[PDB]
Design a protein around this nucleic acid. Structure first.
Ligand SMILES: [K+]
Ligand SMILES: [K+]
Ligand SMILES: [K+]
Ligand SMILES: [K+]
Ligand SMILES: [K+]
Ligand SMILES: [K+]
Ligand SMILES: [Mg+2]
Ligand SMILES: [Mg+2]
Ligand SMILES: [Mg+2]
Ligand SMILES: [Mg+2]
Ligand SMILES: [Mg+2]
Ligand SMILES: [Mg+2]
Ligand SMILES: [Mg+2]
Ligand SMILES: [Mg+2]
Ligand SMILES: [Mg+2]
Ligand SMILES: [Mg+2]
Ligand SMILES: [Mg+2]
Ligand SMILES: [Mg+2]
Ligand SMILES: [Mg+2]
Lengths: 140, 70, 100, 184, 62, 141, 140, 71, 81
RNA sequence: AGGGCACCACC
RNA sequence: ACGAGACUCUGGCAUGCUAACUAGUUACGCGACCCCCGAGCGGUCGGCGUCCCCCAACUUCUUAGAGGGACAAGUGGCGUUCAGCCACCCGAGAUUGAGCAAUAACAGGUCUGUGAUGCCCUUAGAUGUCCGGGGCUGCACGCGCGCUACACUGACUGGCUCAGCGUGUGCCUACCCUACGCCGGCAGGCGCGGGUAACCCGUUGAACCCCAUUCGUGAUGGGGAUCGGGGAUUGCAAUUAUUCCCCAUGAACGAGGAAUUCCCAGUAAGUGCGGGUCAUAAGCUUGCGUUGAUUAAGUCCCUGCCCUU
């Protein structure tokens, strides 16, 4: 029984990928990875598989459960969780060399595939509609 | 800016003048020594003092320093 | 015996944690199966109000808040033993509710 | 595994003729991405936007005016359809057409108005202003017209790449450089 | 006059009424000599290549 | 093997609506040609057979998430209400429409009342939806 | 199908109103006062007219049927709550007033309110707002 | 001046459509409307008819933009 | 019978701001001079072991026009937690 | 006369 | 020595610690459905159950305590080689956002917050107090904060699919949040339950967005003012329309002169959701998330403030 559970975050969206020894299945909330909406950003989800090849994923089944945030943030959380889950599975049940090479590929393409973006919404302050904008000022 | 105030600078100078033999060029060891030998109320202040201690130790190894009399 | 649930509530985290630790230490000394302190989400009551008593000046606001912290402890013990354990000195500001 | 934009357009054959702009038009190699949507922090530091892929910079500049603020999925779809239309109309690589349009639209000399004095234009500002002019021309052509925004953007890019005077960006660049020459 | 290409070798400093321009020193790419001083609008850094439409003028401190 | 979650949901809804209309045992209210589906709508639905589409959508939602009542359905089909010169707000769907759809689905025996309240799919309804999903997958392939 | 028929009518006259034949039928009969989009759509649904055809494409029989249903909604199961003249204050009858009928109804209502010297009638007579709006700053 | 487009084809416009349109490199409802002085709905219906008859080829379909091309 | 009240003495009367404010208030009600009363309270506070103290008396001290007199001693902080 | 600072200044 | 800084709260990191049936995961058992084929250690399940007579392990996800972690610490360059600055590596992070905030002042605002208060006024035909009705909203006009728009980067009609902050039955005190079932086209009505709350609303099926549809440059299916008729709800009472719903009516407005505001990163802007007010209740405000940029890393030109001579 070889499995890992690795999360990825984007804003308030959090996706946990369970990656176990398998035949190459990838699901998000029980749906095929190609069925996740919006499909404008389908390549964002497919990027880990396109970069690493289907051969790396051929030996694992990955099921992703995602919640919170919005549509785009969930897309980014899913892709980050898939990449981090594959890296963790490789570093735990395969050699360190394979983990290093796949991690290098992912990092070279995009660092957010492995490292979470820490940006969060800034608090509103009184005297304006938002964090920085102020209400219009009149003089006469 | 990263200008350290007189609190940090004076604490670092006194620490170096009193415990020069236990200090070195390693920030983390200096931080442990500072927390062992001084009561510094906050972790951030401890880190700033240890960093300036490390900087001054490098300067002292490179040559004499006016502020510190060892 | 009976299953005892102790609910502790406070506005002071440090005193709340001290009381919880003392209760768990007492339960351990009495050799009781005690579920550790379950920490409920902290409640933040907020009141935002204008600073000025009149209506003049820059519209500045005070953001007052109160934080309520809640803990749960589960015990399998007789009621008398539970009361004896809860009879220890309780720090001020901590409200304890015992249910069987 | 070669990376093609939208899965259709390759970057290997794209050539940047102007050597001054070669360091400020990120289009190939490490800058080849499947989509013009990276959610990167390119505005964190100065000059870092030079690393932002040029297609994504165009997509960002299409999010105007206010009513379209933040609708990056819509602008990505607009850019995709515009590239499809460009390929149908010209037979060329839409990335090559975009690069040529930016090169031809960037003004090389401007006036600073300190009476005005002529000054040179840095390559980064050249790229910035080229993108701004192209998007502005497309938007103004598409406003209050049955022609769609994707078709207007494709026409603007094609005309700018050819250097034609039918391009809003080309006309604005010519006016700016003429005024700079007058104030020289 | 033919269009010339120059390479920024040193950023001298800000100039203009509102400080919008940057005065830099450029060395010509055609001839390594003949470095001159130019005023540039926009963010510029060392190693950038400028397209001089008129390579005869000098910045003259704007 | 094909289940609902394996197929495109819009295509599945269209196929299931066509199946319900072809079966023709679904009870349709007399006022389907007069009403609009919510107070935040401006016009009645463009599709004359909107009732079958709504029933298919409701059955799919019950498949994905059982125990939903009329209130949950009105939340599902709610949308943005524009208020003239005033700001827009969320608004719920028509309770009568949701209730009639649920009752018609119960009449088809694809839907039964849940023990804890609300409605859920019967095994027959689950089987029908999975068969429709298989047909959709076969058509796509 | 897409070629214009020989019987296509450029302009129709229905209830002393010029209906443009180029518009789709539903939005073409809205040119009649008293017929809005909702009422037009429900009338055409009751008349079994395809909504996809233009106003000029309708036959004389179809136009006559549409006019009959429009002028007698109650006979065709058009519900009372759909009507713009419900429970008339004088007759108590439910109807859909159209065009000159609608204008006459409005004039009669205003005349009645002014005759009894009700406050709303006086506001109408003076030309001010009648639904309680502030008049200090707007309506100039 | 206001442009008066046609809601339905006349003989000349229909012939011009069926003759010239299947030869354009780019075929969109907007460009067809501009060239033949027809409305967008008529252009969409005509392009759908041409696609059904096989005179043109579909490049991309989207709710906001549909792109056809010659065979 | 459920509620019981007890009385206790303040440990360091000189360090209680409320106690000192009441003492100053009753000295002023007793007709004592403002400067004398304020300086007496200040000296008592400082002798009680305080790092510092500040006493501000505001109002119509002398005549119709109002003003404030501030008496400070030792160290005093104003900002931060 | 010279020198600083600020999107409640400008660029 | 005060102020600055330090400080407190907040944001980001921890597969390390503590430990959870008012949080879950994984595993297993049962059940439902799909695939005869390739029927399996298959796929989907917010279907049920597994310390709770007895029946399973754990804490990644959630919650919240302790501790750790970042120091211009490392490398290169500049610098008097000081203080420090620039760039880069590693790194979750190399400037998160707030709160607090000196001396000395202003005849700045508030006696309409106060059983804070001096003096003056009034005090039974009252300036006390209650009750009834009206007004505070009144409309040739001028000004300020705003909301909705002028459309196709759109409107409409379907379909699909994602949050976070937080509130909830009350001394007086009447007034809570609501699931589910039925009736009604809608606003709503009736019944029957849960919740004093990580327990119920609630997996808070939010909007924008996404996918299709119709419209086709026309003051047009843009816009939704004004106005007629009818139906509900709160209330003792709705007229000078409380609010809400339905049909109908369909104004200006085609991007705005002089002038002028706010703002640099999860920011501006778009978008909706909570709290306050609240019997009835948001075009305001105070918070929250969601989508998410262009431009700049400068200057004293304008507007100011400060310093030196
Ligand atoms: K357009
Ligand atoms: K007062
Ligand atoms: K008074
Ligand atoms: K008073
Ligand atoms: K008042
Ligand atoms: K008050
Ligand atoms: Mg905002
Ligand atoms: Mg909705
Ligand atoms: Mg009409
Ligand atoms: Mg201090
Ligand atoms: Mg401070
Ligand atoms: Mg100003
Ligand atoms: Mg400006
Ligand atoms: Mg954890
Ligand atoms: Mg005054
Ligand atoms: Mg008033
Ligand atoms: Mg409209
Ligand atoms: Mg109109
Ligand atoms: Mg108010």
């Amino acid at each position: 029984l070889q499995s890992v559970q690795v999360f990825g975050r984007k804003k308030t969206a959090t996706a946990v990928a369970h990656c176990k020894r398998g035949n190459g299945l990838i699901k998000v909330n029980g749906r095929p990875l190609e069925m996740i909406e919006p499909r404008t950003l389908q390549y964002k989800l497919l990027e880990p598989v396109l970069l690493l090849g289907k051969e790396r994923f051929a030996g694992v089944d990955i099921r992703v459960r995602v919640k919170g945030g919005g549509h785009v943030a969930q897309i980014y959380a899913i892709r980050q969780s898939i990449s981090k889950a594959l890296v963790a599975y490789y570093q735990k049940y395969v050699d360190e060399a394979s983990k290093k090479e796949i991690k290098d590929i992912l990092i070279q393409y995009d660092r957010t595939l492995l490292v979470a973006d820490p940006r969060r919404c800034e608090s509103k302050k009184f005297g304006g509609p938002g964090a920085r904008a102020r209400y219009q000022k009149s003089y006469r | 800016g990263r200008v350290r105030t007189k609190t940090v600078k004076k604490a670092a100078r006194v620490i170096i003048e009193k415990y020069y033999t236990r200090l070195g060029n390693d920030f983390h060891t200096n931080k442990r020594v500072c927390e062992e030998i001084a009561i510094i109320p906050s972790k951030k202040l401890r880190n700033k003092i240890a960093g300036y201690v490390t900087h001054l130790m490098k300067r002292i190894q490179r040559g004499p320093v006016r502020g510190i009399s060892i | 015996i009976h299953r005892i649930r102790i609910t502790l509530t406070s506005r002071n985290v440090k005193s709340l944690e001290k009381v919880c630790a003392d209760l768990i230490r007492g339960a351990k000394e009495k050799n009781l199966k005690v579920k550790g302190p379950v920490r409920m989400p902290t409640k933040t009551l907020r009141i935002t109000t204008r600073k000025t008593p009149c209506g003049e000046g820059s519209k500045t606001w005070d953001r007052f808040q109160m934080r309520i912290h809640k803990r749960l402890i589960d015990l399998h013990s007789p009621s008398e033993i539970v009361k004896q354990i809860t009879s220890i000195s309780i720090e001020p500001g901590v409200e304890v509710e015992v249910t069987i | 595994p070669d990376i093609k934009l939208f899965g259709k357009w390759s970057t290997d054959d794209v050539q940047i003729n102007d050597i001054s702009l070669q360091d400020y038009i990120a289009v190939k190699e490490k800058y080849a991405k499947y989509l013009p949507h990276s959610a990167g922090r390119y505005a964190a530091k100065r000059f870092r936007k030079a690393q932002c892929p040029i297609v994504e910079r165009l997509t960002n500049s299409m999010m105007m005016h206010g009513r379209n603020n933040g609708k990056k999925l819509m602008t990505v779809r607009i850019v995709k359809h515009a590239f499809e239309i460009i390929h149908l109309l010209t037979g060329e690589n839409p990335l090559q057409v975009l690069v040529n349009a930016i090169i031809n639209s960037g003004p090389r000399e401007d006036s600073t108005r300190i009476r005005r004095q002529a000054v040179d234009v840095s390559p980064l500002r050249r790229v910035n202003q080229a993108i701004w002019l192209l998007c502005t021309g497309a938007r103004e052509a598409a406003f209050r017209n049955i022609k769609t925004i994707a078709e207007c953007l494709a026409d603007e890019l094609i005309n700018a790449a050819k250097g034609s005077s039918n391009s809003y960006a080309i006309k604005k660049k010519d006016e700016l450089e003429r005024v700079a020459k007058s104030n020289r | 006059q033919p269009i010339k290409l120059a390479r920024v070798t040193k950023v001298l400093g800000r100039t203009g009424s509102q400080g919008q321009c940057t005065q830099v020193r450029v060395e010509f790419m055609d001839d390594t000599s003949r470095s001159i001083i130019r005023n540039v609008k926009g963010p510029v850094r060392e190693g950038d290549v400028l397209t001089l439409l008129e390579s005869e003028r000098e910045a003259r401190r704007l | 093997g094909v289940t609902v979650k394996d197929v495109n949901q819009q295509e599945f809804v269209r196929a299931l609506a066509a199946f319900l209309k072809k079966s023709g045992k679904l009870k349709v209210p007399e006022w389907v040609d007069t009403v609009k589906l919510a107070k935040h709508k401006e016009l009645a639905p463009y599709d004359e057979n909107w009732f079958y589409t709504r029933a298919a959508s409701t059955a799919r939602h019950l498949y994905l998430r059982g125990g939903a009542g009329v209130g949950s359905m009105t939340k599902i089909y709610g949308g943005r209400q524009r208020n003239g010169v005033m700001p827009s707000h969320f608004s719920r769907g028509s309770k009568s429409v949701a209730r009639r759809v649920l009752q018609a689905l119960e009449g088809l025996k694809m839907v039964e009342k849940d023990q804890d309240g609300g409605r859920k799919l019967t095994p027959q309804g689950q089987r029908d939806l999975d068969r429709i999903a298989g047909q959709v997958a076969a058509a796509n392939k | 199908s897409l070629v214009i028929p020989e019987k296509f009518q450029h302009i129709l006259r229905v209830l002393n109103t010029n209906i443009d034949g180029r518009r789709k039928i539903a939005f073409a009969i809205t040119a009649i006062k008293g017929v809005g989009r909702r009422y037009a759509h429900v009338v055409l649904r009751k008349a079994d007219i395809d909504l996809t055809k233009r106003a000029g494409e309708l036959t004389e029989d179809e136009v006559e049927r549409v006019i009959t249903i429009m002028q007698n909604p109650r006979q065709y199961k058009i519900p009372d709550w759909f009507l713009n003249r419900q429970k008339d204050v004088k007759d108590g009858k439910y109807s859909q007033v159209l065009a000159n009928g609608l204008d006459n109804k409005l004039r009669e209502d205003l005349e009645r309110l002014k005759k009894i010297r009700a406050h709303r009638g006086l506001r109408h007579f003076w030309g001010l707002r009648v639904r309680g709006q502030h008049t200090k700053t707007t309506g100039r | 001046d206001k442009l008066n487009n046609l809601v339905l084809f006349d003989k000349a416009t229909y012939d011009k459509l069926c003759k010239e349109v299947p030869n354009y490199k780019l075929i969109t409802p907007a460009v067809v409307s501009e060239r033949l002085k027809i409305r967008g709905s008529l252009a969409r219906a005509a392009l759908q008819e041409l696609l059904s008859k096989g005179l043109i080829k579909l490049v991309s379909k989207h709710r906001a933009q549909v792109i056809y091309t010659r065979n | 019978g459920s509620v019981e009240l007890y009385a206790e003495k303040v440990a360091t009367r000189g360090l209680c701001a409320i106690a000192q404010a009441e003492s100053l208030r009753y000295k002023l009600l007793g007709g004592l001079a403002v400067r004398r009363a304020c300086y007496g309270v200040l000296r008592f506070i400082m002798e009680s072991g305080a790092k510092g103290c500040e006493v501000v008396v505001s109002g119509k001290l002398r005549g119709q026009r109002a003003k404030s007199m501030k008496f400070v001693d030792g160290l005093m902080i104003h900002s931060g937690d």
